[PDB]
Amino acid sequence: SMLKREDWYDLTRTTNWTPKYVTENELFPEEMSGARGISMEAWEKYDEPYKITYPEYVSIQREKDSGAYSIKAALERDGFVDRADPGWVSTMQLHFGAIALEEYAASTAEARMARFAKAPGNRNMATFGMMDENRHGQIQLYFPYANVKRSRKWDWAHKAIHTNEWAAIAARSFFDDMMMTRDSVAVSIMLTFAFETGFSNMQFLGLAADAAEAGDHTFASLISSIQTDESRHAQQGGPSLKILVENGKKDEAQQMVDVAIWRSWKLFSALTGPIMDYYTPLESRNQSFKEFMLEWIVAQFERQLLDLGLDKPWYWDQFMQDLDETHHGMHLGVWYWRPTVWWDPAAGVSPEEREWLEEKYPGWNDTWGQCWDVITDNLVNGKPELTVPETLPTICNMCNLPIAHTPGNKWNVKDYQLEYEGRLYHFGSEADRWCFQIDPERYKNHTNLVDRFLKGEIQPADLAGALMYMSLEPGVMGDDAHDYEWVKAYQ
C-alpha cells in the first residue's frame, strides 16, 4: 500500500537547522535572502496552498509534454503558419522573441528562492518552479524552431534578448529588476505575486483562446499547456506577503507590490494591449484590451490586496484612466517605428476597425484617429516616406518605452522629468518617476537607447547606425503586416 500525501508531506519541508560551523548570516546573506530581520522560526509559518511532490511532478509533467509535442508533430506538415493571418504570425514572432529567454532566465529567479529563502516550503516549491521555467524556456525554443526556414524573424526567438533592440532592452529592464537582481523574498512578491499571478496567468489563458480562434492549434496547445504550470509556482508570493504583514513590514511589502504592478503594467500595455486591439482580426475580438483588464486583471488584484491586508497602490485611479490610452500610444509608436522591431506590426485602422475602436473607446477618432488620419492621407497620396521616422522618440528612463499619450483634440502628452546628480532623466508617467526616486541607486547610471545615442555610443550616430547597434537588418526589420492592403479602403 501507499501513504496519503497529507500524512508525510510536512517532512519534505522540515529542512531548516541551526548552523554552527558558519553563521546564519553567512549561510543566508541578507542581500540574497531578504529575511528582513524576521526570524527563521517566523519564516517557517510559510504554507503554500497548492502542494505537490516529486513523483507527482514527474508523472503529471511527462504527460503534459507527451500531449503538446504530439499535437505539434501531428499538425506540422499541414503548415498552418504559411496561411495564417499575418497579424497572427506577427503575434507569435513578437511572443517568442520577447519571452523565451526570459522564461529561461526565470529558472534562475526560482533558483534564487530555492537556495536563499528562509521558508523551507518556499525552497522546495521554487525547485519545482525552477523546473517549470526550464520547461517554458525549452518548449518555447523548440516550437518556433520549426519555422526558422520560413523567415529570419523566427531566429529572434533565440536572438532578441541578446540584442540592444529597444523592445529587448525594455524586456530585460523589467525582468532584471523584478526577478534577477533582488533578494529571495522580493522575488517571491515581485515576480510570482505581482507579475505571474497578477498578469501572465490570465494573459496566457486569453492568448490560448486567441490562438484557437485563429485556427493555430499547435500554438493554442503550447500556451494552454504552459499556463497549467503557472499556479504551482505563481502561488509563492502570497505567503511571503502574509509573513511580512504579520511581522511589522506591511509598508515594505506594499512598496514592492506598488513597484512590481506598475512596471508589469507598462510592459504588458506595450506588448499585449496592441495585440488585442489591433493585430487580432476584427471578427475574432472577443473583447477590448480595456475590457480584458477590467474583467480579468484589475478586480483580481483588488481582491488579492484586500485578502492580504494591503491597500490599492497610490496610482490606482490614474492606472484605471490609462486603460483608455497607454496601449493606443505604444501601438502607434511601434507601427510608426516599425523598422525598429523584429515582427511586422498590423496598423489595424480600417474603417470597420475604427468603428470598433470608437465603440470600445469613445473619443478615439477625435484623439488617436487624428494621427492615423494624417498617416492614411499620406499613404493614399503616395508619400509613404512621411509614415516612417527620421528621429528617435524620447524614451522613459524607467520602463525604456517611448513617452506617449493622448494626441488630437484632447492633447495630453507629458514628460515627468527629474534632475538628479547633474543629469536630466525623462519618465513616461508619475509612477515611473516615483519607482526611480524611491530607489535611485538601483537605476542611476543605467542609460536608455536615447542616452547612448546622445553620448556617442552609437556610431555612425545616425539612423542606419542605430539599426546596426540594435542588430537589425532588412529581412528582420518590421513593416506593415498586411503590406498596406487596408489603404485600398481609402483609395
Partner 1 sequence: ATFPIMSNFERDFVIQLVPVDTEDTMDQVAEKCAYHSINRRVHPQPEKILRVRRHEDGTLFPRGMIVSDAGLRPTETLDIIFMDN
Partner 2 sequence: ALKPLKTWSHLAGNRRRPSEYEVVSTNLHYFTDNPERPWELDSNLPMQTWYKKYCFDSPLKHDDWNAFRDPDQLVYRTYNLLQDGQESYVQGLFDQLNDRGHDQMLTREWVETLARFYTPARYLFHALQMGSVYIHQIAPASTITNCATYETADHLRWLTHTAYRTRELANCYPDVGFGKRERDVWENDPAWQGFRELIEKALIAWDWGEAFTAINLVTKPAVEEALLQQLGSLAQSEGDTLLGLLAQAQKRDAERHRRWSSALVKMALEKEGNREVLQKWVAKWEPLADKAIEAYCSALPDGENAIVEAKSASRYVRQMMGL
Which CB sits closer to partner 2, 156 or 278? 156
Say if residue 119 is exposed, middle or buried (CB neighbours under 10 Å; 0-12, 13-18, 19+): buried
155's enclosing H/E stretch is none
- CB 343, CB 97: distance < 8 Å: yes
- The DSSP 8-state label assigned to residue 313 in this structure reads P
Which residues form the interface with partner 1 (CB under 8 A)? 329, 332-333, 336, 368, 370-371, 373-375, 378, 386-387, 389-394, 402-409, 411, 413-415, 417, 419, 424, 426, 450, 453-454
Which CB sits closer to its own copies, 215 or 363? 215
The amino acid at 451: D
Q: Fill in the per-residue mask, 224 to 263: x = in contact with its own copies (CB under 8 A), - = not in contact.
A: x---------------------------------------
**78 scored as a contact of its own copies (CB under 8 A):** yes
Binding partner selected for residue 392 from its own copies, partner 2, partner 1, none, CB under the kind-specific 5 to 8 Å limit: partner 1
Q: Cell for 122? A: 518556499
Contacts of 448 (CB under 8 A, 6+ apart): 169, 395, 396, 397, 400
Which CB sits closer to Fe ion, 107 or 376? 107
**78 scored as a contact of partner 2 (CB under 8 A):** no
Alpha-carbon gap, residue 71 to 77, rounded angstroms = 11
Task: Quote the least distance from Cβ 211 to its own copies, whole Å.
Answer: 11
Closest chain position to Fe ion (CB) = 136
Total residues at interface with partner 2 (CB under 8 A): 81
Strand residues in 16-77 grouped as ranges (E)? none
Q: Cell for 398? A: 524607467
Task: Quote the least distance from Cβ 335 to partner 1, whole Å.
Answer: 11
Q: Which of 45, 24, 29 is nearest to 245 (CA)?
A: 45
The reply to whether 446 sits in an annotated binding site is no
Which CB sits closer to partner 2, 26 or 419? 26
The reply to whether 457 sits in an annotated binding site is no
Which CB sits closer to its own copies, 71 or 435? 71
Task: Quote the least distance from Cβ 11 to partner 1, whole Å.
Answer: 58
- CB 391, CB 415: distance < 8 Å: no
Alpha-carbon gap, residue 347 to 483, rounded angstroms = 10
Q: Cell for 21? A: 560551523
The reply to whether 233 sits in an annotated binding site is yes
* Among 32, 180, 212, 477, contact with its own copies (rule: CB under 8 A): 212
Alpha-carbon gap, residue 351 to 38, rounded angstroms = 59
Which CB sits closer to Fe ion, 99 or 185? 99
* Among 33, 221, 280, 448, contact with its own copies (rule: CB under 8 A): 221
Q: Which of 92, 71, 100 is nearest to 168 (CA)?
A: 100
Residues 135-154 that bind partner 2 (CB under 8 A): 135, 137-139, 141-142, 145, 148-152, 154
Alpha-carbon gap, residue 43 to 244, rounded angstroms = 9
Question: Which one of 177-185, 257-265, 287-295, 478-486 is the stretch in contact with partner 2 (CB under 8 A)?
Answer: 177-185
CB count in 10 Å sphere of residue 422 = 5
Residues 433-452 that bind partner 2 (CB under 8 A): 441-446
**Binding-site residues for Fe(3+):** 103, 133, 136, 196, 230, 233
